[PDB]
Amino acid sequence: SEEAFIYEAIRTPRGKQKNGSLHEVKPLSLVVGLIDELRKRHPDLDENLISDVILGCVSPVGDQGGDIARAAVLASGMPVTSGGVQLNRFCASGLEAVNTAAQKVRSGWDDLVLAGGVESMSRVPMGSDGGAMGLDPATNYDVMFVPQSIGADLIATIEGFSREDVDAYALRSQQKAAEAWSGGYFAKSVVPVRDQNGLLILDHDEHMRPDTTKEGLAKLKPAFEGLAALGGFDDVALQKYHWVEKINHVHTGGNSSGIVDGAALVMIGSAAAGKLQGLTPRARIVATATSGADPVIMLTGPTPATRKVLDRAGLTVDDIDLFELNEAFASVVLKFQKDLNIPDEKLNVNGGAIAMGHPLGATGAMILGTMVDELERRNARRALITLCIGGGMGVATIIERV
Amino acid sequence: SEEAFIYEAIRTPRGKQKNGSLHEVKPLSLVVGLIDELRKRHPDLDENLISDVILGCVSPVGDQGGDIARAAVLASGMPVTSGGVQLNRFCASGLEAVNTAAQKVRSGWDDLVLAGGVESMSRVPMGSDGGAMGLDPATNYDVMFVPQSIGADLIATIEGFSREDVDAYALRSQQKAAEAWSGGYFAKSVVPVRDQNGLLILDHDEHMRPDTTKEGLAKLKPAFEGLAALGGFDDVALQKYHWVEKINHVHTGGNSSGIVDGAALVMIGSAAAGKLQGLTPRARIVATATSGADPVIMLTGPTPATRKVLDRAGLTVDDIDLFELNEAFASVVLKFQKDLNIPDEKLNVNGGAIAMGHPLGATGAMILGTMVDELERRNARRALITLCIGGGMGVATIIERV
Amino acid sequence: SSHHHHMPDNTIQWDKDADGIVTLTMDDPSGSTNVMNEAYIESMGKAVDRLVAEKDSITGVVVASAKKTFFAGGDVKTMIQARPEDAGDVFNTVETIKRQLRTLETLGKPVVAAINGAALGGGLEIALACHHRIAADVKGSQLGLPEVTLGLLPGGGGVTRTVRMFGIQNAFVSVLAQGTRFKPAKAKEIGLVDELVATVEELVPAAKAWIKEELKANPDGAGVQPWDKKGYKMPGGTPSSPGLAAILPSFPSNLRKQLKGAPMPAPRAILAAAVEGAQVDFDTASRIESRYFASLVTGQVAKNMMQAFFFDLQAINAGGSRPEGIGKTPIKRIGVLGAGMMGAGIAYVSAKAGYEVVLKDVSLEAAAKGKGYSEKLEAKALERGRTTQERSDALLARITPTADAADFKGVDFVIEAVFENQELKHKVFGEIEDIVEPNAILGSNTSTLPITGLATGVKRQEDFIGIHFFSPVDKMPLVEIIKGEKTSDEALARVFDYTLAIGKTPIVVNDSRGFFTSRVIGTFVNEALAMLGEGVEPASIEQAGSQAGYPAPPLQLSDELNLELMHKIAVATRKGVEDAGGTYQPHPAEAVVEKMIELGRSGRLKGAGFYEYADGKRSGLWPGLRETFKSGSSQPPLQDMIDRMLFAEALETQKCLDEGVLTSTADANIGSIMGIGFPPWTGGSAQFIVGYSGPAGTGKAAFVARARELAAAYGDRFLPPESLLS
């Protein structure tokens, strides 16, 4: 039973969508820069023992097409035997890559694997890749496709989360993110991005608004830009959730995840491969799980995926020190907290995607590394990382500090 | 840890690129049709025990974007907890999906997984997804990119395979595919495609030319379509392989893999999963391996991948009863046969992609299931399946009949 | 592949003129209209074969018709009989039809459609295969693709060609999704027709003139459709165009929003065929369209709608329920009693048909307001372009408001529409009966009170008759004609003819409490109120009504029917059998009706019902509803809520047929669809039985089984009657 260990976990700063610092940077450059950072931390490391590079990417087209993981292996001069595979499980892609790397180590047919994700949403916007669940009428009509934000509004309606409730969570996410940055929690894992001359492009999470007030959040208009304003989706959602009369549209750009650019890498390997390369393990992958829920509400798959990974590890909520759930929408996190009775001070303790951003394919790997650091900074033992997914899926991972 | 077993392995017929029978069929429909066939073969199977659907897809755009594996779960009405993830490792994506499914079972954190791939190249041509390389001249220039067909001509030049040698292999592939079809070898695994009315669309591999003659193959002109016929790629290849003076362009449409549409599904699970659902195991995944070689020659990575998977299973070439290597190009197979001294009667014994086609994302699972059927038919024990990959990668898998 | 598909009397006349222009004149000897039937396919097969064989001596083609219309409709008799095993034959048939049109379309020479009259469905599909369309701007002519109204789709290339001409969105919304018919001016405006001529006699000359000038000015483009040119750009882009890909996922959701989630396979199949066809070449797109067409034809919904909207409706319009042998009687002057919502609407539809109308009420102020209903409607119609000023002034001038019974002098057709009260109706008729002509129809618009009782208040009872309209009268398409026991066959046929003249559809019903429409829609409303009392969420009840296919959810309709009036109908139906020595089992809804009244929430007219009302507009369900009825305490499946309402009406309709209230299933189907809003996809509350499909299966047996499953769970009112059993 080969146990899998996290030896490094790093990420770029998240650059904002409009007039963002990373808009001029190709998403491949974001991955290569993180590869170069792992090299500086381990120039001794025999890269021949790295058997695969697994990158999550939700929109693998254009700048992100052609197996961007392989392009990273080749452009960074890694050995040609280091593989390179792209995977897309929507929002979970970054964590699915980590979990798949862990399962490949447990199976014993890989020894040392790089895993993470990349998403340059300012260059490759969400939905750039097409798809049948949206652009095939027969399939769209049957599965009752609804954009994710309306599922979030529907969750707030069913659970009774008011506009002030979701805005209260948005404010705390901005505050906890600013405190983590000012406290220096992120100084070692956020690798600043530089150009081909070494000049600085970005060294911090641009999307944050650390001066957010509850008065400013109340001024924002509910979501009106993008797919959710084209019409019909409220009626489609209420045709399935036929017992609620009207959707309370509580979510804005201020209490929803930011559209950003970024990348993240995680080094995963067996205990033998670790000591063979002089690497100090940072944490252990205890268990992983994948579960789902209705694709119309779409954002309630985290709860069964969290229970499943807890049953698998023989643990319960009281055994977990830190809970990290991606802040796609404030109601999704409040629903998750209510469902599992998560203590407030254990949940997304360093802020989340509302403040810092949600670069689809990379987010799962980013918030996993965020928990690797925070467990170590607190001398705490266990953390549970989970994300909701489009189409009604969910993924969850439990890590244990070493 | 946990042994992984193949319980079912089916595939669609491969429709040809030009005026093909499957051109009017959406790639999602190809996958759903196979899902429906697995239901017909196991009507009482508790689909809630299926934890993931892993599909290989090399051009995940348009009809193949938006995580087509998840779309297949939702379109076919599978349980919404059944996941769905798309992956791309170029030509080995189909076998990589099976391998990843096997490793997820071996990890113990999955029990029953559908794996395979889909590629509708008549609707979504190769390169449709762009690529982090071709759109990046700085990357393209540094990695010395060369299309796969020129590496195949270069392999033939270096190894001494003449135009008659590769055309001779193309002939044996057309002959053995016809013999397999006539002998009814494919009767129960090739699932005919039907429309929404049940009308037949295609029931055979219509790319086959069973009346192929050496005289006819000798009349074909060398590869003149796609990227390769553009400028500069020979000079780029010979700049790296500087001891080679001239590339012998021996590969044509008649000795290269066919551009086709198709899909494939494989049911993989633990012994307990099969016992619980009353599934009979057909074969066992003995070992998998990933490796590679230079990306400019590109197509010699199967040799260390095969050596590594034999090394991983404590086996030698003598122990393997059947060798299945994807017929991307004739010189690639001849090089693999020359390198490992593969007995000619053990190699691609039922024909290959030159006769039947190479639907990128699906081919790996197609030729894998082809060997499950033939090990059973011959009552043989072991088979090794492998595919070359773009960018210089390779994937191999050893299965053992149960 | 062939232009033929394996007797049929040839349907197309051939003429090659001196210049080589071949005129194909379509003239089916078996009917008044050219129809896309087996004879047409064989004839156009010969004609297209010959156009190819004589290509060296042919310079152009003109498609014309010797009928009053151009070409209208298809082979419904064959399509309604197509079983699932016949899907190959249906597919091959439209595949053959389109090979003929595709050959015609790509001969290398121009083809012009001389459209002398209506070109509907397959008729327009023929013209869309031509390169130029000239239409005579005559009265009555219409152009469009109304296949969706029969549960089908334009499977003869209409989907593929209109999408190539207009793009996915415009073709679907404007032409395909609703099968809208257009008069020649609108047809040219939107691009279905290229140019117009004033008379049919100019058509073939204009066609040959266009062929000649097209050959001279565009010799390389003559006979080449836009989508057959290399630089063809589909309007609005292809599904791969980033601009169209951004909004394309909203098209199925807007479709679900408009259809409210009801079963509508044909619009879904049209949208899929439209988008799927825009992703591939024209020939592949055309075959995809054939497969979706065969998918609809072999499905039950298309057979429900072909039965109702083709066979039942034509049997009704041909006089199925009109008494045999009766002749025609003119209507010179209509007298309408009462100028409320009903009387004002009756006065409008009557004057719009050309009848002189005297609109009487108790005061000239009231009657003038009644005519104001017609003038608000004409004002809206004028500014929107649906009518001219000359025709609008003539309409309104036919309505004479009055308050004097003397102004009914010369009225030969009385339509009374005052308050529902036996004695008021007796007196109102008594003081006009001697003023109107001695042959005047004495019609009463009542929804409850039996006609035989109202008729006793007139001397000439053989001319008294029920003429039941539905509000808003200008938009509701049915007239329920109730035959009293003394009503003559002549009075019945005179009202029957009036109904067709005002452009509505008649059913003939024998006198009985609730007649057909009121009695049946009462079961639909009562079933919902029962569900509310059982503790089902009001929002779920309303969703069940819309997803069942009803035009209005049932609680919303209950507020508009007024709960006080619903109580009266119940109080008057109890006496109607206890004062006649019988048993009356209260409906569960009456408890819900009576408690809403107890709370002062009697409906919309009072300003408070199941909904809150503000500014003449509905504004959400009353929040005190959930506490009052313990909403949420009962959560049955939505399909059980849907079936409970659909089955209640389907069973009550069968009762009406068993008691002789109705005399045909055609009246039951069209009467339910047009009268009270029974979902069109069902084909009617009677067709709903023969075509029911669910878990068990399809047919009358499956309906009985599901009705028995409903009776076990929700009450014995769902038990099927003896007539539906073996």
Ligand SMILES: Nc1ccc(S(=O)(=O)O)cc1C(=O)O
């Ligand atoms: N193995 C490690 C790699 C990186 C870091 S960090 O740079 O402090 O984040 C810490 C450790 C550790 O052992 O705690």
Ligand SMILES: Nc1ccc(S(=O)(=O)O)cc1C(=O)O
């Ligand atoms: N700086 C801290 C160190 C340790 C812990 S705890 O003991 O794991 O709770 C918490 C904190 C905190 O900042 O809240």
Ligand SMILES: Nc1ccc(S(=O)(=O)O)cc1C(=O)O
């Ligand atoms: N979508 C489903 C398909 C199959 C099955 S099962 O195989 O009958 O368990 C269950 C479900 C479910 O939604 O629970």
Ligand SMILES: Nc1ccc(S(=O)(=O)O)cc1C(=O)O
């Ligand atoms: N478990 C099986 C499923 C399918 C088939 S096949 O249809 O003959 O390919 C055979 C077996 C077997 O036991 O050999």
Ligand SMILES: Nc1ccc(S(=O)(=O)O)cc1C(=O)O
């Ligand atoms: N029909 C055969 C059965 C068995 C075997 S063997 O046992 O793998 O040698 C080979 C063949 C063959 O066709 O060559």
Ligand SMILES: Nc1ccc(S(=O)(=O)O)cc1C(=O)O
């Ligand atoms: N009522 C009809 C609606 C549509 C069509 S069709 O679309 O031309 O087939 C025909 C008719 C007809 O009765 O002839």
Ligand SMILES: Nc1ccc(S(=O)(=O)O)cc1C(=O)O
């Ligand atoms: N404005 C009303 C209209 C109708 C009715 S009721 O239907 O007779 O209850 C009552 C009122 C009222 O205000 O009392």
Ligand SMILES: Nc1ccc(S(=O)(=O)O)cc1C(=O)O
């Ligand atoms: N037919 C039913 C009526 C009532 C309820 S209950 O209100 O949830 O008890 C449930 C059902 C059901 O089928 O689940």
Ligand SMILES: Nc1ccc(S(=O)(=O)O)cc1C(=O)O
């Ligand atoms: N009661 C009926 C009267 C007339 C017809 S009809 O001649 O088929 O229209 C059918 C029925 C029936 O009950 O099915």
